[PDB]
Design an enzyme around this catalytic site. Structure first.
Site, PDB file in Angstrom:
ATOM      1  N   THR B 112       0.810  -1.209   0.000  1.00  0.00           N
ATOM      2  CA  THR B 112       0.000   0.000   0.000  1.00  0.00           C
ATOM      3  C   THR B 112       0.845   1.261   0.000  1.00  0.00           C
ATOM      4  O   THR B 112       0.360   2.316  -0.421  1.00  0.00           O
ATOM      5  CB  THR B 112      -0.907   0.012   1.223  1.00  0.00           C
ATOM      6  OG1 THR B 112      -0.104  -0.113   2.401  1.00  0.00           O
ATOM      7  CG2 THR B 112      -1.837  -1.166   1.170  1.00  0.00           C
ATOM      8  N   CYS B 245      11.077   3.581   1.624  1.00  0.00           N
ATOM      9  CA  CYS B 245      12.034   2.572   2.043  1.00  0.00           C
ATOM     10  C   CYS B 245      13.341   3.226   2.475  1.00  0.00           C
ATOM     11  O   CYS B 245      13.666   4.348   2.081  1.00  0.00           O
ATOM     12  CB  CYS B 245      12.301   1.580   0.911  1.00  0.00           C
ATOM     13  SG  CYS B 245      13.422   0.232   1.339  1.00  0.00           S
ATOM     14  N   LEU B 419      15.790  -2.812  -3.981  1.00  0.00           N
ATOM     15  CA  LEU B 419      16.902  -3.525  -3.361  1.00  0.00           C
ATOM     16  C   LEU B 419      16.364  -4.783  -2.688  1.00  0.00           C
ATOM     17  O   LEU B 419      15.803  -4.722  -1.592  1.00  0.00           O
ATOM     18  CB  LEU B 419      17.624  -2.629  -2.359  1.00  0.00           C
ATOM     19  CG  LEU B 419      18.841  -1.848  -2.856  1.00  0.00           C
ATOM     20  CD1 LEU B 419      18.435  -0.764  -3.832  1.00  0.00           C
ATOM     21  CD2 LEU B 419      19.606  -1.250  -1.684  1.00  0.00           C
TER      22      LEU B 419
END
Lengths: 532, 446, 112, 112
Positions: B112, B245, B419
């Site tokens: 999400t 992230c 990654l």
């Protein structure tokens, strides 16, 4: 079997054997090795038919799948049948031989470092009355020539002059007057095709705005007929991402530009705008190899261009300058002649607006001032107001130069801030405070009492601009400019969202968010002072 | 209508055959599909950002729109034209032809947090690899994802593509996800997001790589200038409520520069905190022991009152002190993914280093770590620190995000996403993904 | 057991390349020669400045010992090869693993 | 041009505005990349040259715009260590250059 035993098959044809082979390999579950014994240069179709179906790790034709024949090895360069592993069993897992990077862990450490700022200019420029003959006198053996112009100006007794001077030593030329107010994605290719049929070696850009830059575009399209065009736009969107190369010109044509409108610095900037044909998608092009090597700024042109299109161009240049100075990209370099043009314009605008051609003084003066402004923001990028006014002009067909001129006021009032650290980034690094810069402008005109505070000077500044732009007979609210406002409110919403990201981005020292744009737009439309 | 393994398997067969004869295409024709798809995904970032705003629920619009900008343009500029069709290299001297070939059917898991960029990312690189991709949108954020699926497929179809290459789920459900994730026909899976998710992903007996991150630590020594780092990580901390992230999770401060840094936050919108409000926020921080799922992207005032305390409104991030202990049980130790941060009180350079290493291992993935220090008086310190730390990637005096002034800060770097690793286990240094991870080999020896 | 010798020296040598430490699971069939190689190669290494050992290997290898170290926490990786049944338990570890194996190797012969 | 002699390069082109008539014809087979070192000389941008004779040191000034190098780089790394007051010498030379330039009758608005 892993023992000196073997079982064979009875195949029917090439394809039967291929099918049995593929079915046979899958049983292993690992695609490792497979072998073809066949004639070799009568059948290549067979070779890679077979190669196409088989998914082992490794295909050998007319070769044993081992090591050691006569002498060196058969075959003499190959990894062993062992050493072939995979991170998966599952199926079709093509084995890969092992290497130390499979046994070793990585590091990159990125460094902290400083940047590059810039100042680059076209090499060659001329400036006077009757430049044309003495300007082009130095045009010896450049043989082929091409005209870029508009049918209005070509319609006037103007192009005739230059083609006659081209005959003066005699050039194979052709006029192209087939561009309207904008680059289209439609004329660009016909012009490119026509000239590349002609193969001209000199390109003559004439006029104001659209005629020149579109030329540049299709000019470069002549240089590389091969490539497509998005990636010219998509690849090169703005400054400082010098990543990576050029479309490779300086090639087989040169650029000689003639401005006509006092107020655009386009003929020096390496900028271009092209509009799509479905819905008019904007495509901005910006990189320094677009700069023409040749610029000429004559006056003879505009003694007769009427008010207040004069005002429109002048106000566009005015905006260009004030935004450029306060831009975060502003080096010391642009400050000098930006300040110069601003100082020198304040006298000759009212005169030239009132007087002309009776005053063949102020007109060329403001012409040069506009050229200097173009020099200025050639390195310092535009402000948010500029593309935002691009937009207002876009939907309502309003001309450039006055649309922004209706905005500047509230714009600096947006900059009229002491220290809102709500969205600003890296404020105290190089740009201490815009307010001070504005006050330097104020006292630098002497627009301030010797004993003053900053904000005093600031209100003096924008009051100055207020009834200054009063002097040139312009509406003070966009409703007074003749706009239906119900739909204004209806559609300002998405107007603002595209106004945000329209390449503004933007040396604007402060972030805007969608909300503030909307406040400014409504205040300006009503002539209301955007103040908080 | 994508709801049951009847139609699921039917569409599997459909996209699966479509891949079968799709994989037969020449490079110089898939290129056009590439350019057009990139373009047509490229302009209309604002819509899917907007309806992502409505569907997902939190967050900041332009962060979303220009991540779309950056993502699309990075993807295209990232992989202009790299030979992926047929022969790769030849040795006529030894007659060894090395060619390559697509893999097959792959599933894609959409979290999400970035429901949009990830989808277009995977789909675009898939059509690079001449692949077929299946999507598992989250029931939160699926409608915008399916809209993107429409839009990108429509661009592709108006380029000569087979009638579909996308599959995606309507009303996604766990059993459907396990069914296709354990489906035989699928060749690979690409998952990202929750730690719990990728572990079930690895529990498949099938090839799998998961893009995740751990707690991202930064340490500050005495010889750095405070306001610099203070700045950079306000920008990163505030980025769309810190949902990207590889973002800030732990602030490590050496001894005698400590309280001055603290008032520097107090000189700004950050709210320091040292009282029962520690527990008052730690309740909702980790309710179930599994990272309560509505602190996500929520404003500082909202999370303060919704933790039970009233805060000055313009505040941006809350700062936790109850962190002298270093272990899993600290909720500040886990990642926060919201405009919240907890700091440490370090003693010396080596104390901070030890706390840092202990802090990273909790994430289980070595992804990112940050040093704020003086730079050419201390090189010994630089790579002392570099020696101990095993993340994927070390940055010194830099925020761990994308977008500063102009181009990008830093202006050449892969995103904090993209990654992944083939293992979770420990010290699993993430590697960014490339098409050779999506392509199968051949050498033929002559 | 098929290549008890070459594989061992292979792995050990490339390990000292990677500045690694390697543990061996010889087969109860073929272990004595493998352990002899372990001796010999370590002895060469020691008479070059190596740390006192870099090899570990099992005496009387047994399945439970193999699972214990294969599931040992401290180990970073495993390198298995041989029986299909072996590498599948290898993959069933939740740990990074790559197995060197092969399938049925087919050759086809046409008329030409 | 290895061919021509040199006076007429000087004798022919002494200063500005007698653009009579042609060039020695370069842009040819070499390009110019210049690095200044002294803070105070604008020579590395000017199309100027001074050469001195060998009998008695006759001055020969050369001035025409094709002498301008196409490439100029202005780094700083160079002069942190150049001592006082050679610093002052260069700076004062530049100072003179500026004040004379502004009041020069050739001063357009451009240089101002």
């Amino acid at each position: 079997k892993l023992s000196p035993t073997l079982g064979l098959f009875r195949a029917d044809n090439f394809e039967d054997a291929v099918a049995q082979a593929v079915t046979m390999v899958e049983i292993g579950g690992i695609g490792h090795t497979s072998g073809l014994y066949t004639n070799q240069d009568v059948n290549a179709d067979r070779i890679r038919y077979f190669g196409d179906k088989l998914k082992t790790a490794r295909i050998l034709v007319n070769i044993p799948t081992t090591h050691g024949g006569i002498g060196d090895l058969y075959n003499f360069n190959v990894a062993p049948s062992l050493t072939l592993g995979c991170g998966s069993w599952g199926g079709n897992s093509i084995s890969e031989n092992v290497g130390p990077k499979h046994l070793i862990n990585k590091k990159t450490v990125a460094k902290r470092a400083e940047n590059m700022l810039w100042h680059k200019l076209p090499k060659s420029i001329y400036f006077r009355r009757g430049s044309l003959p003495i300007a082009l006198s130095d045009l010896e053996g450049k043989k082929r020539a091409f005209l870029v112009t508009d049918r209005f100006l070509f319609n006037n007794g103007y192009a005739d002059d230059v083609v006659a001077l081209l005959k003066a030593q005699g050039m194979e030329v052709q006029t192209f007057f087939e561009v309207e107010a904008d680059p289209t994605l439609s004329v660009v290719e016909k012009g490119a095709a026509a000239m590349q049929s002609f193969q001209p070696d000199v390109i003559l850009a004439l006029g104001g705005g659209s005629p020149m830059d579109a030329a540049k575009i299709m000019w470069v399209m002549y240089e590389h007929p091969d490539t497509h065009f998005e990636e010219l736009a998509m690849r090169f969107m703005d400054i400082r991402k010098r990543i990576y190369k050029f479309p490779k010109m300086g090639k087989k044509a040169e650029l000689v530009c003639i401005t006509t409108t006092s107020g655009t610095g386009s003929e020096v900037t390496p900028f271009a705008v092209v509009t799509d044909d479905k819905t008019g998608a904007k495509y901005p092009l910006a990189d320094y190899e677009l700069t023409p090597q040749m610029a000429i700024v004559d006056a003879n042109l505009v003694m007769n261009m009427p008010k207040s299109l004069t005002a429109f161009g002048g106000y566009d240049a005015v905006t260009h300058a004030l935004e450029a100075y306060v831009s975060v990209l502003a080096n010391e370099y642009s400050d000098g002649q930006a300040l110069q043009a601003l100082k020198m314009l304040k006298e000759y605008l009212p005169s030239s607006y009132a007087n002309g051609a009776k005053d063949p003084i102020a007109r060329e003066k403001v012409h040069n001032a506009a050229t200097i402004a173009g020099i200025a923001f050639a390195n310092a990028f535009l402000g948010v107001c500029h593309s935002m006014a691009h937009k207002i002009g876009a939907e309502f067909h309003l001309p450039h130069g006055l649309a922004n001129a209706l905005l500047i006021a509230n714009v600096v009032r947006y900059n009229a801030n002491d220290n809102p650290t709500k969205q600003t980034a890296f404020s105290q690094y190089d740009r201490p405070q815009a307010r001070r810069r504005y006050a330097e402008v104020a006292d630098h005109l002497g627009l301030s009492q010797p004993g003053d505070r900053t904000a005093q000077k600031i209100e003096r500044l924008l009051t100055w601009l207020d009834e200054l732009k009063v002097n040139l007979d312009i509406p003070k609210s966009i409703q007074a400019a003749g706009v239906a406002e119900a739909d204004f409110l209806a559609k300002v919403d998405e107007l603002a969202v595209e106004a945000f990201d329209d390449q503004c981005t933007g040396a604007n020292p402060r972030y805007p968010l969608i909300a503030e744009l909307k406040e400014v737009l409504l205040a300006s439309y009503y002539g209301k002072p955007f103040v908080e | 209508p994508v709801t049951n393994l009847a139609e699921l398997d039917a569409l599997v067969a459909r996209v699966k055959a479509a891949q079968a004869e799709f994989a037969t295409f020449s490079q110089e024709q898939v290129d056009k599909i590439f350019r057009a798809a990139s373009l047509a995904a490229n302009q209309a970032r604002i819509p899917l950002a907007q309806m992502a705003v409505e569907e997902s629920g939190m967050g900041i619009v332009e962060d979303k729109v220009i991540k779309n900008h950056f993502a699309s343009e990075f993807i295209y500029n990232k992989y202009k034209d790299e030979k992926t069709c047929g022969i790769l290299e030849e040795d006529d001297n030894l007659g060894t032809m090395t060619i390559a070939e697509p893999v097959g059917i792959i599933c894609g898991i959409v979290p999400t947090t970035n429901p949009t960029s990830t989808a277009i990312f995977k789909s675009l690189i898939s059509l690079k690899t001449r692949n077929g991709i299946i999507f598992s949108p989250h029931p939160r954020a699926k409608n915008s994802t399916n809209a993107a699926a429409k839009l990108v497929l429509d661009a592709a179809i108006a380029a000569g593509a087979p009638k579909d290459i996308i599959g995606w789920i309507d009303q996604p459900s766990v059993e459907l996800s396990n069914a296709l994730m354990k489906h035989d026909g699928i060749a690979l899976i690409l998952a990202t997001g929750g730690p719990g998710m990728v572990k079930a992903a690895y529990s498949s007996g099938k090839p799998a790589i998961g893009v995740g991150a751990g707690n991202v630590p930064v340490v500050i020594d005495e010889t750095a200038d405070i306001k610099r780092a203070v700045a950079s990580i306000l920008m990163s901390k505030t980025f769309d409520n810190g949902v990207v992230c590889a973002s800030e999770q732990a602030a490590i401060v050496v001894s005698e520069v400590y309280d001055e840094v603290k008032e520097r936050f107090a000189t700004h919108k950050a709210h320091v905190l040292s009282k029962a409000d520690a527990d008052k926020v730690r309740k909702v921080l980790l309710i179930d022991g599994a990272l309560n799922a509505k602190i996500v992207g929520q404003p500082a005032a909202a999370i303060a009152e919704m933790a039970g305390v009233k805060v000055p409104a313009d505040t941006k991030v809350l700062v936790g002190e109850g962190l002298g202990k270093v272990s899993y049980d600290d909720e500040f130790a886990h990642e926060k993914l919201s405009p919240t941060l907890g700091l440490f009180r370090a003693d010396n350079f080596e104390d901070a280093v030890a706390q840092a290493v202990t802090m990273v291992e909790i994430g289980g993935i070595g992804h990112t770590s940050g040093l704020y220090t003086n730079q050419d008086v201390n090189a010994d310190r630089i790579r002392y620190f570099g020696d101990k730390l095993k993340t994927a990637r070390i940055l010194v005096n830099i925020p761990t995000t994308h977008g500063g002034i102009g181009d990008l800060y830093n202006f050449n770097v892969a995103p904090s996403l993209t990654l992944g690793c083939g293992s979770w286990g420990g010290n699993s240094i993430s590697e960014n993904v490339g098409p050779k991870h999506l392509i199968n080999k051949k050498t033929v020896a002559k």
